[PDB]
Amino acid sequence: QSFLNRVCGVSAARLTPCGTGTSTDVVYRAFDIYNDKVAGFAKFLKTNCCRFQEKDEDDNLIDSYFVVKRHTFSNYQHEETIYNLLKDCPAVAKHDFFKFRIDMVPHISRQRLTKYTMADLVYALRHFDEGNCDTLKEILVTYNCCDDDYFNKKDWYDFVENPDILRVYANLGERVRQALLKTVQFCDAMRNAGIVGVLTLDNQDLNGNWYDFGDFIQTTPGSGVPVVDSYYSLLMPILTLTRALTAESHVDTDLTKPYIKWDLLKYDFTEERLKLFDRYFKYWDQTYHPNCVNCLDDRCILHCANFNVLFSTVFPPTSFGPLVRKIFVDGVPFVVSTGYHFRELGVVHNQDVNLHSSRLSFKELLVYAADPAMHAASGNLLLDKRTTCFSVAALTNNVAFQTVKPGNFNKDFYDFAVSKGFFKEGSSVELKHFFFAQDGNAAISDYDYYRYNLPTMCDIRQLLFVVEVVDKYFDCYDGGCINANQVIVNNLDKSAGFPFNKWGKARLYYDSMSYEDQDALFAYTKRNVIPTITQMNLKYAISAKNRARTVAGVSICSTMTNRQFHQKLLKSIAATRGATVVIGTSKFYGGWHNMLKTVYSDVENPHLMGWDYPKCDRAMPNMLRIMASLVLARKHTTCCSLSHRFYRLANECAQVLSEMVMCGGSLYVKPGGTSSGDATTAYANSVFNICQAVTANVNALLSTDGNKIADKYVRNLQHRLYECLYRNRDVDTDFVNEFYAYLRKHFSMMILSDDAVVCFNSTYASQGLVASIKNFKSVLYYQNNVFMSEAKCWTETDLTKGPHEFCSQHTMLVKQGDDYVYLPYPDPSRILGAGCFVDDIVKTDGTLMIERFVSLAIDAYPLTKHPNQEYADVFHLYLQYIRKLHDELNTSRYWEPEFYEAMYTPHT
Amino acid sequence: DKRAKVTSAMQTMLFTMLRKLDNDALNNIINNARDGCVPLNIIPLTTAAKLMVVIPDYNTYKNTCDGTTFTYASALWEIQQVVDADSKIVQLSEISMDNSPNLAWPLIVTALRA
Amino acid sequence: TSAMQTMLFTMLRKLDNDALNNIINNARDGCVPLNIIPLTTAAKLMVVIPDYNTYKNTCDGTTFTYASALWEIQQVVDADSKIVQLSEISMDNSPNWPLIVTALRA
Amino acid sequence: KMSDVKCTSVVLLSVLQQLRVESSSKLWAQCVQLHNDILLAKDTTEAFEKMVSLLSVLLSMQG
RNA sequence: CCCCCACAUAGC
RNA sequence: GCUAUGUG
Ligand SMILES: [Mg+2]
Ligand SMILES: [Mg+2]
Ligand SMILES: [Mg+2]
Ligand SMILES: [Zn+2]
Ligand SMILES: [Zn+2]
Numbered sequence A: 001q002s003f004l005n006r007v008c009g010v011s012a013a014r015l016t017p018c019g020t021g022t023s024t025d026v027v028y029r030a031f032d033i034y035n036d037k038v039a040g041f042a043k044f045l046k047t048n049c050c051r052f053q054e055k056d057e058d059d060n061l062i063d064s065y066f067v068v069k070r071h072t073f074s075n076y077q078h079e080e081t082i083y084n085l086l087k088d089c090p091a092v093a094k095h096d097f098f099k100f101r102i103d104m105v106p107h108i109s110r111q112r113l114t115k116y117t118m119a120d121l122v123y124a125l126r127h128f129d130e131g132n133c134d135t136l137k138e139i140l141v142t143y144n145c146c147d148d149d150y151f152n153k154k155d156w157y158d159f160v161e162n163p164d165i166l167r168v169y170a171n172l173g174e175r176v177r178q179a180l181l182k183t184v185q186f187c188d189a190m191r192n193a194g195i196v197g198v199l200t201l202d203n204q205d206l207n208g209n210w211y212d213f214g215d216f217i218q219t220t221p222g223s224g225v226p227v228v229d230s231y232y233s234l235l236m237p238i239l240t241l242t243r244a245l246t247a248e249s250h251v252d253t254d255l256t257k258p259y260i261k262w263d264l265l266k267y268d269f270t271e272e273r274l275k276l277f278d279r280y281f282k283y284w285d286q287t288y289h290p291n292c293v294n295c296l297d298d299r300c301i302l303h304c305a306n307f308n309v310l311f312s313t314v315f316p317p318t319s320f321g322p323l324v325r326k327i328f329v330d331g332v333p334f335v336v337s338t339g340y341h342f343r344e345l346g347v348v349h350n351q352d353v354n355l356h357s358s359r360l361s362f363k364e365l366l367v368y369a370a371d372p373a374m375h376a377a378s379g380n381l382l383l384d385k386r387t388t389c390f391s392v393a394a395l396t397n398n399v400a401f402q403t404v405k406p407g408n409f410n411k412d413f414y415d416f417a418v419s420k421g422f423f424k425e426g427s428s429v430e431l432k433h434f435f436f437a438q439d440g441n442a443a444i445s446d447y448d449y450y451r452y453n454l455p456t457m458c459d460i461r462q463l464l465f466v467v468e469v470v471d472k473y474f475d476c477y478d479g480g481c482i483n484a485n486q487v488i489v490n491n492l493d494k495s496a497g498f499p500f501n502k503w504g505k506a507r508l509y510y511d512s513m514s515y516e517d518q519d520a521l522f523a524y525t526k527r528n529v530i531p532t533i534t535q536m537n538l539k540y541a542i543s544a545k546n547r548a549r550t551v552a553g554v555s556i557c558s559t560m561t562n563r564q565f566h567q568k569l570l571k572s573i574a575a576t577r578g579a580t581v582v583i584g585t586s587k588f589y590g591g592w593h594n595m596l597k598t599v600y601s602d603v604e605n606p607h608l609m610g611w612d613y614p615k616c617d618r619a620m621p622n623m624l625r626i627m628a629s630l631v632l633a634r635k636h637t638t639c640c641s642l643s644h645r646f647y648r649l650a651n652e653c654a655q656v657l658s659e660m661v662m663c664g665g666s667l668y669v670k671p672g673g674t675s676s677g678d679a680t681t682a683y684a685n686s687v688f689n690i691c692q693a694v695t696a697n698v699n700a701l702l703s704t705d706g707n708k709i710a711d712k713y714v715r716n717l718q719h720r721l722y723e724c725l726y727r728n729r730d731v732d733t734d735f736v737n738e739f740y741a742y743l744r745k746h747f748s749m750m751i752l753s754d755d756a757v758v759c760f761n762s763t764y765a766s767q768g769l770v771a772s773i774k775n776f777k778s779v780l781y782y783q784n785n786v787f788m789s790e791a792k793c794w795t796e797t798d799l800t801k802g803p804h805e806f807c808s809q810h811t812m813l814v815k816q817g818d819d820y821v822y823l824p825y826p827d828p829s830r831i832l833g834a835g836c837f838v839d840d841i842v843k844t845d846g847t848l849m850i851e852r853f854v855s856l857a858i859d860a861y862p863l864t865k866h867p868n869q870e871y872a873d874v875f876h877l878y879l880q881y882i883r884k885l886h887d888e889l890n891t892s893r894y895w896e897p898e899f900y901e902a903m904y905t906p907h908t
Numbered sequence B: 001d002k003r004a005k006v007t008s009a010m011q012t013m014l015f016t017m018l019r020k021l022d023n024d025a026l027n028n029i030i031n032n033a034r035d036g037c038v039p040l041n042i043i044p045l046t047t048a049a050k051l052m053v054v055i056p057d058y059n060t061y062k063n064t065c066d067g068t069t070f071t072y073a074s075a076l077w078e079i080q081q082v083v084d085a086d087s088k089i090v091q092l093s094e095i096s097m098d099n100s101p102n103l104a105w106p107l108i109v110t111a112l113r114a
Numbered sequence C: 001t002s003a004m005q006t007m008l009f010t011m012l013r014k015l016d017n018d019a020l021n022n023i024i025n026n027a028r029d030g031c032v033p034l035n036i037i038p039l040t041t042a043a044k045l046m047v048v049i050p051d052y053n054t055y056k057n058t059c060d061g062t063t064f065t066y067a068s069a070l071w072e073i074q075q076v077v078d079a080d081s082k083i084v085q086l087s088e089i090s091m092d093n094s095p096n097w098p099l100i101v102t103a104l105r106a
Numbered sequence D: 001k002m003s004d005v006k007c008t009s010v011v012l013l014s015v016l017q018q019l020r021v022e023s024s025s026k027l028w029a030q031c032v033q034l035h036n037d038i039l040l041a042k043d044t045t046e047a048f049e050k051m052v053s054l055l056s057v058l059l060s061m062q063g
Numbered sequence E: 001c002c003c004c005c006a007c008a009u010a011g012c
Numbered sequence F: 001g002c003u004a005u006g007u008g
Helices: A002-008 A073-083 A118-126 A134-142 A148-152 A165-169 A173-193 A229-241 A244-249 A270-280 A298-311 A362-370 A372-378 A411-419 A442-452 A460-472 A506-512 A515-525 A556-575 A591-599 A622-633 A642-655 A681-702 A713-726 A735-746 A762-766 A773-784 A828-836 A846-859 A869-888 B002-019 B023-031 B040-047 B058-064 C003-015 C018-029 C052-058 D002-018 D025-039 D044-060
Strands: A014-017 A025-034 A039-055 A061-069 A095-100 A105-110 A195-198 A321-329 A332-342 A346-349 A381-384 A391-394 A535-538 A550-553 A606-611 A660-662 A666-669 A747-751 A756-761 A794-796 A810-816 A819-825 B037-039 B050-055 B069-072 B075-083 B107-113 C045-049 C063-066 C069-077 C099-105
Touching: A002 A014, A002 A061, A002 A095, A025 A118, A025 A229, A025 A713, A039 A118, A039 A681, A039 A713, A073 A095, A073 A105, A118 A134, A118 A229, A118 A773, A134 A148, A173 A195, A173 A229, A173 A244, A173 A270, A229 A244, A229 A298, A229 A460, A229 A713, A229 A773, A244 A270, A270 A298, A270 A346, A298 A460, A298 A622, A298 A642, A321 A372, A321 B023, A321 B040, A332 A372, A332 A642, A332 B002, A332 B023, A332 B037, A362 A515, A362 A556, A362 B002, A372 A391, A372 A666, A372 B002, A372 B040, A381 A666, A381 B040, A391 B040, A411 A828, A411 A869, A442 A535, A442 A550, A460 A622, A460 A681, A460 A713, A460 A735, A506 A556, A506 B002, A515 A556, A515 A642, A535 A660, A556 A622, A556 A642, A556 A681, A591 A747, A591 A756, A591 A819, A606 A762, A606 A773, A622 A642, A622 A681, A681 A713, A681 A747, A681 A756, A681 A773, A713 A735, A735 A747, A756 A762, A828 A846, A828 A869, A846 A869, B023 B040, B037 B040, B050 B058, C003 C018, C003 D002, C018 C052, C018 C063, C018 D044, C045 C052, C052 C063, C063 C099, D002 D025, D002 D044, D025 D044
Parallel strands: A381 A391, A381 B050
Antiparallel strands: A014 A039, A025 A039, A039 A061, A061 A105, A095 A105, A321 A332, A321 B037, A332 A346, A391 A666, A535 A550, A606 A756, A606 A794, A660 A666, A747 A756, A810 A819, B050 B107, B069 B075, B075 B107, C045 C099, C063 C069, C069 C099
16 A cells, blocks of 8 residues: 555545556556657557546545656656656646655556546547547536436437437636646746647646646747647637637626627727636637638638637627718718628728718619618518517517418319329328428517528638648639629529519619629729628428428629629539539439439448538527638639638628528528528538538548558658648648549548438448548537438448438439449429429419429339339329320320430430 | 619618717717728627627527527627517517427517616 | 418318318318317317307317317306306207306316 | 318418408417428327317308 | 529430 | 429
């Protein structure tokens, strides 16, 4: 008992051996490692430490531990020399240096350390797997965020089912903030002591103390430089998952004190942002611009926006949004927006403002009518308790209470279908897709799903690498600003948004403005910020789910300029065949087979893996939408300067990201996420999809043991990946090409908007060298605030059966002609429900039903090749109904089935 | 031209929407600003006369606006009217816990600045 | 406008469930429910009976049948605010017409 | 069998929506609740019970 | 009364 | 040029 009598020392603590006594215990903790051998953020075995738990007087166990590491004599003398230069810092754990005769061997005894370091909590939240949460459960239990019976409820981890888990993590937040303050004090002591080293997360206790001084080097005092890039960068998602700076809203940053009564007219907060940065991120080496209008390039906009996401959670929500000013026209006081305050981009002031103008021509009154300033100033104050979202104004004295009408019934096709032996009890095909009617609160209950959007920081070094790899997926296209005469608009008889939908459709605004007026409007948006208002419309579709669908029709003053900004790149993406993004590719004439053989290219051990995003429209963070818009604007180095590109980014982020959305005659603010009526929503969704897949591969490659990797090219790739993320701040433009070639060889993808199917290497994913479904689940947990259910996302082992689900189409291999052709077939319930239920009763006229049913039969031809017989009889029923209708009132004529098999033959 | 017609329509709606503003508390907080500009989110919060609260159930009613006066946005509000979702006029005496399943929720109360 | 009711009644006759044809042929005689029929046990139901032969068929002693379910009679209003007992009305004193009965699910 | 229940509930709610019952919110809310839980139903029993509820709602007013 | 963006397809 | 349908 002599060694246990020695470890207590003069601290006077009652101790019990946690492991076997007078020998080291073997634990399995997460580490942050960078040597010449192995680099990454993974879990390892720590076998050089013997640990003792401290007991209270009532002998229940205490969280304080005595971690004794016995090492070489060199590290002993070195850490004694350095700890004597650091024992006066408060944020350094107590070290007792002694020697003992187990044969003497040097011993380093640390005092009152915690069972789990900061890296354990960071790895447990960033690599989350259900049924493997024992470290996270132990941390959540021992810090009274919740008791042990909280986990007996299942779906407790889910942010969508159980939103009390954010309230659980907010109790870890203040311990995280105290750890941040102790980190800043430790960096101050390191600089004033003349010590140069790197701060890693696994050397920090959950109390905030720091305890491992082996790798540190002395310098002259006052000249020490600590390295905190990997520390803050890996810690950044935890700061907004646990809401670490929520104590800064109080009067002297104390939780047992009331809130700060900020002035309502205050909007700047720039000194507050700089003061917060110097309080918590003092030794972060890159410069922080609070307003991102002073940012050099887009890789600085991402940096300062990622800091503004965290810092804008302190400031009150009334200070954000447009900045209005009194402006006279012929001596008549108006109120128009001469700026915008962004949660992400800081304060942005318009450049071209006319305080006095005698006349108001068409362009400036279009800008003044699209502004939310006049509407939100003239309207009544609104307090909507149905919604968690911040409500600003109500434009009427009434409240709109629109409902969803049920779908009309086609009795004739149902009688024809029961005449042909369908819908017998026990057949595999039945009705499962109907028009679901909704009550009056449907629009506001669907708008309340924007509560899933939470302010989310990103790993900014990891995100800055991932944006460079995602830009490689968009290399073969070209883009740039086109003129107003070069635009191509599909349907002019669509609504122009609020408030423009009163006076006419978008045809009136494209026929009333000349090309010079549209080009002047685009040139205005390149130098000013126009905020707009998007109306929430209820979508009228047929579905299997009970939920309502809401689209966000953006006004004409945003889409008219977004078309000229993005149209060349979007048309180039839609025109290119064979690439990763498959927008614009037909599924007809062998296009489905061509896409599947494009994915199935050279992957050695191919499986097929497909996933889905839970609430992709709502839970999309603002950093990833900003990154998608920056990637799509990276095609503008010739036609736009840096200021023009930032003002276009600010215009788009003020029009489709933090817009003033009018849901039923009363304005609300939108917390974030994509908009369905954006001019570029599919392509930004594709950028976000490629971003999540690339960062899942990065998290897969960095969180494996580099020693256990058999290959040495892959191990060197991992060691270079950690360096390109967390060491160099330049973009290593040839390692980016190497990682892009590695992902093209082993993780080949097909990406439409949010649906995706990959063809990955089985032996690499089973070794943990590319992404699997587990890494996708972890990435969507920490970067998307959702839980991707494993029961939805699928894995396919056999190649000759294609992907299970892509664009809601199932695929089957068939012999067409003489060669084996993949064909897409839908679910027969969807085609049958589209046949027997129509959206309007005027569409049950025969001159429209012949067109509707020939289109439904073109979509339903590849069911005849299916082995199930009633699936094959679906198309025969549709064809016989078209025969009946056509006989009521030749391969190019549409009542004989070779017309429908010509749509899937590859020769056109 | 029809561009003249739509620009006349937008001109009249701008002219009506500026008369709807009354410039007293607007001019006070605009001219009290330092740079001359204020956030839009505090313009109806400190300028508007009417307030409309939409209350979904009865337990929300007893916390936010119960009685004839209530305090929201650091001001006193006097309840002018209470109208249910069918646009009918509802009295204050109808709102009770025993009568609450008979009421057509949500209620849309209308308050004026004191 | 008018044909959608005829198509609904055609497929209602094609359904041929006993509760549905029971309710529609009681509605053919003038027996009309005044509130939404509940399916929870022990919930209130309002229904009217227009004549005495409808009382002969529909009302059954102390527990009357409706929608192929039995309902316990509690209280009757003859639309004149006269609370009618179960022992009061018989065929001897059938002039009192239609009378509103509350009920509970058995 | 059960498919005709769903196909007649959709046209029953269509007749109700044409009889201007959507002006009354308190009635239309439970009508669409009954109709949605008819279409989501997988059994004949609860479908026919909610069917007699919706038909009693129709037969409440004259039409 | 409201009914978005993008792509594919069919008939004139 | 109009209409319709599928997909996100
Ligand atoms: Mg360590
Ligand atoms: Mg999705
Ligand atoms: Mg999908
Ligand atoms: Zn910057
Ligand atoms: Zn440009």
